[model samples]
Target: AASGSALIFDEEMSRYKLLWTDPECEIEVPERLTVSYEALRTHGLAQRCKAVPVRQATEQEILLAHSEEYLEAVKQTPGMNVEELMAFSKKYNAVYFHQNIYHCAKLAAGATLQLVDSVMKREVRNGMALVRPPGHHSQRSAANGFCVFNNVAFAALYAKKNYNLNRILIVDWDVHHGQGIQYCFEEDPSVLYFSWHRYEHQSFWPNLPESDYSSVGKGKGSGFNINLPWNKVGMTNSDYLAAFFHVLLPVAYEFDPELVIVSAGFDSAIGDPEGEMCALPEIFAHLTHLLMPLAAGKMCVVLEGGYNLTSLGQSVCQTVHSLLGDPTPRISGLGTACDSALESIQNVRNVQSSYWSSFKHLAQSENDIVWPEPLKRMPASVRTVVVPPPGVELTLPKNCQHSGDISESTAKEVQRIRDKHFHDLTDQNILRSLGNIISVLDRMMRSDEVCNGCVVVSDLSVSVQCALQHALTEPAERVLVVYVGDGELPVKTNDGKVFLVQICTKETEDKCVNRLTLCLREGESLTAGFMQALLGLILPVAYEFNPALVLGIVEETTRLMRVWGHMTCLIQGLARGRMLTLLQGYDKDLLELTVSALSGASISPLGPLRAPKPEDVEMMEKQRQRLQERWGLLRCTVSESW
Candidate 1:
């Protein structure tokens, strides 16, 4: 229960400054570290953390990531003149040297090692090290970018060497790809390295085709290294989140690391001239928060890259605040990702599909989305309605205040139906549950004050039927029924009063009329395929369906129940908050959770990213292969153009 966080820093790490001006090297400055540290101090985050002192990494420690030759060359740098330093730097990509850089690099690498030690030793739950010149770009034999000793790479090796950690996951969120770190562990199965750089189809800095998505490590490390290459600039908060939900997260969680490390970079944040992205500083909080549940709360984030001083400071504050266990700050401006972002996301999932079960059953996207124009053009017309048994009790939760004007006749009709159908509602829990759901749905469709409602029942099948039967009788016109988690549909109706969409983990062979099933591997969190299903598949179809009412029913023990609840709430808001959630059980804890969510609590259901296990992938693939033709959103692979 003790969630101690540590901050690793030392003023000596700031001594490494560029003495001579170089265009490529100027932006990677000493202030990148100090400003971040100062912001942490200003925000009172530093005081909350156990301050761990930085130590100089010994020559042997440097040798963990660097060769003796590279280590020896770096040793001779502290005494070099500006002319000699610049000449020495030309041997590596975008690297500049100064008399003090050699010592400072040692401090940076050492600070990261200290942070990792604190977490592994149980001195802290997690920690972040503010170090520079940032690592992740340095190679074993040569220094590249601003990185010298490969702080993160060395810390990982150090962790394995000392703590004997068998599984280590290093996530590089830097805008530019950390090619050095990738090559370091590409052949080692003990470490899974994931990174997304400003690839621009291999045109970005370091410009290695190896940094592209097709490179999935070599030999034993083949499936271990995951690279998400951004083909363009100006990616926004949604783009980043889409990458997490669709690509990175799935594999990360599957790897199931015992120790998690982040090459935490903010250049990917907005206002950074280098990144040219629109993602805000607070975006790091969501990214950081998503990774906390893995490795038993043991995560270490080492500063990597961020240029714009103001955004870098703010971004750093966000990362530290998340590590300090604060609630994730609100993230706004999240529209759907650009086409380029989706294209990249789909490509990575496709490429890795061969390796990850999570990706194995990707949607086969044909770009063949033909809209349903008939429903859009049709005029509103009356259809046969299911008349409820005519004056029953409509028990309402105190939260469900009617907001709509109900006419005297309509009110009398509602009472009539409830009286006939729910006369013994108080005598039996099932009837009471049925009556409650109907009232909630009726109020949402016709009331004046109610925006949403939450209900619990003993039976999922019975509750779903009750709500649907009531909805079919209302003036809502068309009803869109979405099932999250698991439930059984009433096999009893063919009235076409509703359009059914179900997202579950089980594979089914049966196809129903006017309904869709988006089946995923059970227990797999909402990852790449689910995002595509929601944004690509469901949204397009839902808009065409254009139901006046929306209902989300969730199972009490649903996979990613928290996430399911959040997505349900999102759809509710998408309908301008004209929605309701029904839980399949009367569990008190789940009831409170439903109530809290309906009241607008923020829920992040994604745990650290991981690949869904094979059985799960095969299960989803079974459904996908059967449903791709029926549901265009289920497509993941490229096919004929629309």
Candidate 2:
């Protein structure tokens, strides 16, 4: 088993600094490295971690992501004077040079590779490397944005060459885009490079159009590259989490990388003069925690660009502690994502869906915009009825205060399928919530007046079961249970009457015979590629099963819920929108939004999307092989038989 975490650092990395008087290069100082390492020591975090020493990258290792000509140019810097070095630095945008920069650059790139080696070899669960002349912005041929050598880029190449690794995820959370890293792996599918930068609509530094969301990738690497451009500043935890939960995490799970590399930069955190964002230091904890489940905990964090020393230290400590499995500090002030954040995220979803497949329904192509635009109309026959009956009040009886499972007076032949509980079923909350949920579900099933319904409850499992149990009545013979997250079912058996399918990160054994696990990561709502798999697999399955009622159980995060709310709008149309949404108590207003979506008031951004891990397609195939013979509708494939 893997032991404690690891840290790779060297005092020598601090030797490179901007010797000339340039406004941009002044903050790219040596203290950025020394201060971060010292802060870790001040917190006693250093002693708790297994410290790994650094070594200079060999010439062969440096060549992995750089040109030999560029290597030769960097070497001649030691012999050059002020004028020659100035010209050398000018060739690379926003970079500076000094006598020792070449040596320091090699060490920085080498230290990252060392951390990568340690994590891949299972010497540590995960680790961090504190190096200067940050790497993400440097290209293979030249440096850019105060970066000397592409440290993180080289680490990706080195990890693959030495470890024979097939997939590596490079997550650059810096405030500035890693255009260099993007270009390095833009044409290669083996690496999934994601960076969220301060784009300001292409007005920020290194203001190239390629930094936009539309520059996903080229050729074989099309869907592999993810770019999140922050068109506005003052970005907070909500914005960061929105992007991570809605954009990055979903594809990451499908990619199922063997290793994860964070181009970890704290400039994106609050109080940075450069980033100008309000994301709290502890926000890094949540970001790190979300990715920890991947690659069996083999992750490496390398220092990139963080100018604000105080906030940087706070961000670094929290992130390191999270990697150590410490409890994350409470995240506060989760408000609505800024309009620009939503627009930016939606734009990326629109462009990426065409390539990824999950977002395919969201965008069939760039010209189509988001599917069935809010104003555009599908034929009335296919459209879900948004209006509900006016006179009939959908309410619970006032006489029945609340006792337990279905009050004797209100119980009135509540239906059942399996006779026993999956676990114990007598909890008061479960019974109370189940009774009310059943009441609403019963009315929806009986009357066409209510096209769909939404209920907020304290007990999710009971509400879900109540809906499932009531769904199979005189009119509706069977039910389709679609779960968007990981919530345990309270039932003992599936029995084909209630067909359950769940999309979540962790995979579990399906206790019920009719259950299918469509394992996915956090950003299920935002990823149209994953949506492709849903349209291809689950959607077809639902249509074939032809359930009289569709019961959906989903969880909500800040922006992810809204992304799903947009998602909820579309699901109502499925099975002609005869659906009931069950929530585990409001979920920070997501419940209300989702309830509104049941009437097609709001729309879900998801379209057809796709997934990975020989596990995803393989498990799906296995499930299809086993259940399709009986279910019939689960049969479908992405491969073009055409």
Candidate 3:
């Protein structure tokens, strides 16, 4: 498997700027690239990535997504004088020209292709190309929205032809719509294009009726082109995440693209004059992390449109951090999406439900949502695995630590707790296991050397209870415990400090404010239907709870291991990566899979997911109806009647 991330940059791409005054195009500056690259270097992120050089895109390559007439028109601009450049730029919408812009545009397109090649050849796992002369809005015959050439569009076509990749996914998170890309792929079924731009009901820039949710696609590509128009501005992190959880993710998983391309525009982040949104820079990390698991981790993030230097640099750093497999910073104050956002989300879900099976469980999110600054901390280690005595032989990921014996103080604490909770305190093996688990928890809570850890314990219920007790005494204010098994929870949830959600096969009448039980059909095999509960119920509740730490407990069952792996990977988006997973039984495959997820490796794809069973969907719908009043994220549709 590809291991490291690739960073593609060239100073030449930053050589162009607006030659004349135009308020709409002024924010498209050369510093956009320089500042982002400088931030990456300052944070020591640049050096960690495999540095890839940029090259100028060939005319043939540019023609992959552009018309010959358009390419010839742009080719003459490098030799144009100031007056000629001004007159030429006037023909396009919100675009400017400089003598070096044509050259820089080729480099921008070429840099994206380099990153694509690097990822496709397994030279690097994934990467970000900090290119300028942003693409996405530039069309086959015209430049619009400060874009010179459709770099990402060319890349999708290139990947399809050269790598023979079908089902390429283009995710445009830029605040502005990538109408150029949408137009190019609107009639093609091979590329699934999803963009959530600031629409404001067709009042925003590049206003077009096709940007609305009703314009699914044309001909064979119907339902493949997803347009999530942000009807209002000041969209918070919660609003963005809600779109992913309820809309993009489900469809993207079903599309199962061979390559994933992100039009990573930082303008959507807070402080951008253009975006005017309240989402902070750290939210980019979670966004990047959530998409990393797709396409088997083959993702290329190309720059599009971030104007504010401060947030642009910060957002770029966050994206690179997650690309480097670092734990994401925790986002706080994530509540329900604003009314406007919910309306758009529901509209898209309703429109596209005809094509994607994942949307069959249909449900649906806007909000100026004020939010606290996300907390950032770097743990000394990414993940630590604690195995019991007579350690199981396993191949661990690089940099993963095989934990040593717990400290004496932690051992004593474990003994004290053991004495109070269990009669088997004298069992050296059990004591050692408990000590290791607690020690890892202590390190995570203290923000010491560990970000998250996985432990194989002798007793699932007892170990979970003991771990909960130990965690409650730590610095965590709210703890979210997700238990996946077929038994009663090992801990109570009435204490207000711990919020527990258990997914099991057994049904129970017990349900409360702090506790939720999502019971799958008894004796039924775990199927794709579980995804409905995960996306619609479990995730929303957890986000609304906003726990400081997450505790995952799973029983030994091979049948559920794949879903368990995906769950482990997804929940890491919360709690700043402060998670402890306890496994009841020892299975090398399960342990390895859990460690892989905690280490930031992409879980194996679940294949093209079908719609959840209708009965399962109804079960989750009833659960959502019961709980939506308290947890707002669970509300997908505008009204319960829908």
Candidate 4:
């Protein structure tokens, strides 16, 4: 027997699949829940989720809500071997098989429990438990179906006892009814349960005779129980949708649940062996869109009951995309029928009269639900320019003028030079700042990535305008300024705050662009006031005057001088250790590069280098040297630049 055979089969066995290498294995399982946790990870949901590493719940924390007997039973079980594990699992009613199931389940519950902790702490709006061996069917008394532990049930209890939560909503859209969750909260007013399952007369298993709509509750919790048994043959989008509109949504809006937990199962889809419904793949995406507007997006879905591998995988991906608000696009490959489904919906609505009377939205006739067609129009726009790659003949506009030994056109060429060499520098902070500077500069130029004729420009604030006028102005030409950053005004600039010097003709636009470069040394204050000098802001940044010109500049003199001054001091600190040679030649060059990189950082400028001393420069150089070692670059002396 394989190591996986070591696990004791639990209450969630038959429906629990442990395949790791299947083509459809798109979600992750915890090792404690199943052996496939490590194997099936194959870069699944866990890898895709931005949430940091999903962790298991602590035993001490578990004890706060779980029974001591149950807690003791789980903790002591994992350390045992296969035969001992098998014997132990059979003894406990909730035990399951596979060597890793124990660890996987622990992780699964831990992931969900952590989501609960996060929700209470306001870390996330809500989270989905990409867990295996689905747990809603599991009970505190014993595990049933493929579940070993009741993760949702336990979480609800934890939320109640720990955070003093008085109300919780458990929404199950899985193909199968969660008899375990329904029975568990039958008499509790604080917990509202809504379940819509496939009840095709007598076919589906674990049939609960008491799971119909009229079976509210026993006493104080009489109004909380809600189960809409789908009685038709084809469970189309409209069919499931009708129940949500007529029954589920009405009660939920009234309940005002602070939290919603979704038992999101894909087995309800067509072609699943055990399922009795025929849901199209896109329907899942629609269902998620409906959930997004609820409770300020406070929701989490737990995986369960999907047998058709293709339908299961696609549904899970669609659901996640829904939570992310990146709902899967309607697949041209898959067909969705909406006509007959609407009729089926009417059939269910006609039969459930009292159900409609119970809620405000439902009390109205079927005609009240407007069947408006989707809008036929959408609005979108783009404006950008392409900066040629490194080692190219980067040109600049011959029209614009500049100061010093650099000619007017020569000044324009600096942007390309700086863009190419900025990343070559070994300073991380400087590297990042330079990228920021370049991107903003490009947008200012209205240069699209493909060197398209369209140019995108961002809206300029007064501060940005103040900086731009200081740099330059627009000349007469057909400028194509495509506004980009933060609600750019639709109209063109009347004065010279940020006006485009557009290309003279379409032919001129096709030519390669010339780049502008700027090299600054210390003590040169272009701004008259402290605010301008302190901010070191630039404006009219990318206003292109000529067709074949790429405009950008990096003046590192002021910042560079500061870095050299700071490092010179740090060199003195280690003077206590050594007698001489505190500042080396190459160390100074690294400081220079750091300053160079800083020039590119845009709205969020990199500091330290802004007013660095000789000592700061020295330390920064040493840091750069380490990076050089890491990248296998040649180390040089400061004297070289000097």
Candidate 5:
């Protein structure tokens, strides 16, 4: 038959036949590929063609298009079991199934070769090969997607060799960019590769940064390639056809291809993740029909990729029907052109002009091009744009455990960020004159039983050590810290862990009721900086945790409230929380805010700078004793009570 024919049938190559093959490789073809392959066979019109003899490409034959190392990897990887083939396919980016891939691929190659032979020798007019493990995305060194080899590209080269066909046009209609083939033929004048993919206005995958319109081929074959990346999705029938009419078709007509092969990737279906905005299935048949007249029936369509099973199969069926010159049902205005699509067409035209002067008409005329209509506004009906609402709110307390006395604003917030040492250490909370008291107590002449247990603590600085030690030694196995250091705390460390304690009170006679309440420490984490400043207020309890170590990090005073005021709030909260826990055991509902009973904070700076260092404290103490004795003797001679 002078009329070239098409073949369609379920080869049943790996049905209930129970063929053991390689593992699955989605990286090769991805998931959406075979579903489309399956969709192609259902066309009744495609069932009439003769079953052509299968052609197995020799290893030497396949290697013609690839590097030696890559070819060796594909050939030596696996061939025995289907699983290994599948596994190897997946080891890289290639997708394949062992059960039917080997057989299907050879048969597809055979069909394409026979088609090539038939076209050249004028056996049949033009033909198409429905093959799987579609090739195109695969690279020279790597098998990407489902393609193990570049079938169309190889076939194009093969046809050029066998039939002496020159200036072959390989139109890759697949959505994703065909990077491998582009690099392969970028310099070869024998091939004119044209492709229109889902570019989404530069948002599509496989980002070809350098493959923009400005990038025409260079060197010997500078202008043989054309690329149009789709700007947006949801493109229907016309959006695709318009692309062909305005760009691909015009170029093809100008280039004058002897034999045209379509690298069809069907992932651009409406519901496909890979497709993004897919065209109607019937459009493929229309596109096939459009190209048929141009080639005088010399067109050969080889499967590249299509993922959606239903769309893939339906579109392939339409393509086969179109090959038979059958008309599909028309869905008028089923396709609309996005305004951006026209802009892209224009962009390509301007860039393409440098190579081909035929498109120069586009440069001078402004009104010749028209924009395509966009998809119908779906209102709230569109599925992609909607976002679900959030769930319920959580319940939390109002007080920020760091500060007490309620969150008062304005005047009540008055806090002195103290920088001066003498100004804040006035012992405002305690009125006890430690030296005078010792003088009075000494003169009183009796150390009462009450005084012995009371620990006779007077110094606010030492009281911190006393209360802490008392809490530690009390029947409780663990030490409970009670910080009494108030206002403008100093830096200190205790037992490896650090804490800052702050006590706030009324400067009036109301200081007796507020007992120390909060506690802060670096429990499990590195102490934060703000917490370090707070540790200054943590008074050590030396009695309970006997031989206690009091360490300080902040030795200098700063007037900066931002530095210390934050520390006060933190310590105050910790004290309040811990105190409430302790009060659970103590019945003293008493809150002391008065100094009549309570003593103000006091410290002895000259009294003995306690140091674990120098181990010579005994010697230092002897000198102190000697000086004191001399002073006392002088006092006895000088005055009455000195």
Candidate 6:
């Protein structure tokens, strides 16, 4: 399995800058690359990555996405004088000419391809290339929007031709539409291009009628193009997440891409002059985390456009931290998406409903949301803790600590609680397991060293109760418990401290705003269709609850280990990665898969998903209707009364 992240960079890529004064092109500077790389070093992220050097893209490789005539024109710029260069640049829109731009552009494109090669070859799981004269806006025949060679487009084409990968997903989270990329792949169905841009009703930069949601695609690729036009600015973290949950993720899982390439532009973040949107830097961590599980962890993030140096640098760090598998920082103020954002989301979904089964359930936000700087903390080295069953051969994953015994003080504390809770039970082994479990929880709560912990116990019910009790006593104010395969929760949920959701085999009458019971007749054999419930219901509820920690309890009878792993991986995006997974009975595959997820390894790609069973869809839809009033992210359609 691929284990590390590759960092493709070379300061030489920042060798060019705007020669003349053009406000539209002034923000494209050499320091954009320098500041991002320096911020990575400052945060100690650079040293942790496997550094891959950058090389210039060869003429033939450049030809993959550009025309020979355009390539010849760009090549002539290096020999031209300043006046001739200016004259040549006049032919392009919102772009400048520098004597060294041709070479820098080639390097930028090469850096993206290098990262792709590293990820595709299994030398690394994923990577980010910090190159400038940002691509994505550069077209096949013209340089536009401060871009020259269209790096990501070239990489997608190169990967498809070289690796024979039929399916590729390009996610352009930049605030600007990657029209160049859309134009390149609009008529092709194999590559799915999704872009959420600052359209403002076609009043924004590079404004084109094609940037609107109506341009699904052309011919066979009609459904492959997804344009989410942000009609308003000031979009918040909740709005961005809402788009992913309701629009991108569901369709992405069904598309089942073999590779993913990100057009990572920090201009969409708050403090960016270009974006003017209110989403914070840390939100990138969650955005990156959610996408990591797809494509079997094969992803390449190429720089696109971000002008505000400070915002750009900070956003770069957040993206790299997630690529390094660091725990995601908690996001606050994740409430309902503003009206304008919802309008765009609905428009896109309604337009693409014919192309994807995920959109079949589609039914149909604007404000100056202000927030303080999100709290930033560098977590300790220890990430995951595991308590293996006795005599079970459990090989620990890298960076995972084994918790076999509890300290004497914790043992004494556990004994007092155990005796107080159950005086009749004195089993030594059970007591030992409970003690270790409590110790792990205590350690995770007391310090930032441990992000999450997993335990295998004889009695999962009792263990979950004890863990919940201990977590409530600690700093965690509210805990979100996701119980998979359940009879009834051992603890009460009416109290405000705990929000419980149980997935069980039989329908239960006990349902409320705080406690949700989803019954799937398939029992433990959850299909890809389970994503309907997972994304549409479970995830929305968890995000709305916004607990300080997440506690997941899985029963031994669950046969689908990958589903559990996928669940574990996605839930970690919440609560700042503070999670505890409890498993009943000993299954090596289950334990290994859980540990890998907790250790921040991406879950393997789920193959093309079939449409959810009709019964399951009805059940989840009813639940959504009941819960959407409280959980705002669950609202997929606008009410007719509105």
Range of the 10 consecutive residues with the lowest summed lDDT in candidate 1: 375-384
Candidate with better TM-score, 5 vs 6: 6
Rank the candidate models, highest lDDT first. Answer: 6, 3, 1, 2, 5, 4
Give lDDT for model 1: 0.70
For TM-score, candidate 1 versus 6, the one ahead is 6
The C-alpha TM-scores of every prediction are 0.68, 0.61, 0.95, 0.47, 0.51, 0.96
lDDT of each residue in 143-174, candidate 1, tens digit only: 88888989999988999999998889998999
Among these predictions, the greatest lDDT belongs to: 6
Which ten-residue region of model 6 has the weakest summed lDDT? Answer: 362-371
On TM-score, the candidate that comes out on top is 6
Give lDDT per model, in order: 0.70, 0.69, 0.84, 0.43, 0.46, 0.86
Off by over 4 Å in 2: 364-642
What would the per-residue lDDT of candidate 5 be over residues 436-500, giving only the tens digit for each residue? 22222221112111110111222444334323332343322323233333343222333423233
How well is each residue in 478-586 modelled by candidate 6, as lDDT tens digits? 8999888858767777777788888888888656788778887674335655776787778877887889989988887764665877888999888888889888888
For candidate 3, write residues 101-220 as lDDT tens digits. 999899999999999999999999999999989999999899888888999998999999999997899999999999999999999999999999999889998989999999888999
Mark the regions of model 1 whose C-alpha exceeds 4 Å error after superposition.
332-336, 362-642
Query: Candidate 6: TM-score?
Result: 0.96
- Which ranges in model 4 have alpha carbons more than 4 Å from their true place? 1-48, 59-95, 327-642
Cα TM-score of candidate 4: 0.47
Candidate 2 achieves a global lDDT of 0.69
Task: TM-score winner between 3 and 5, please give it.
Answer: 3
Summarize candidate 2's per-residue lDDT along 1-642 as a digit string, tens digits: 465689888999888777779998888888988898898887777888999988888899888888999989898998888888899888878888998988888888888988988888878889999998898888788877888788998888998888998889999999998988999999999999999999998999889899998898999999889988999999877678667655776677667688889999999988888999988887787688667756766889998999887887778888887676543443434534567887787788777876653444444222211111011111122112211112223322221111123446445433232224434455555554555666566555555444556655665665665567566644576677777766567643345666777777687765444677766534433354344345445644554465667777765423345345534543442444567766654553565465544432313223223443333444555665666545433332111234
> Model 1 Cα displacement at 127 (Å)?
1.7
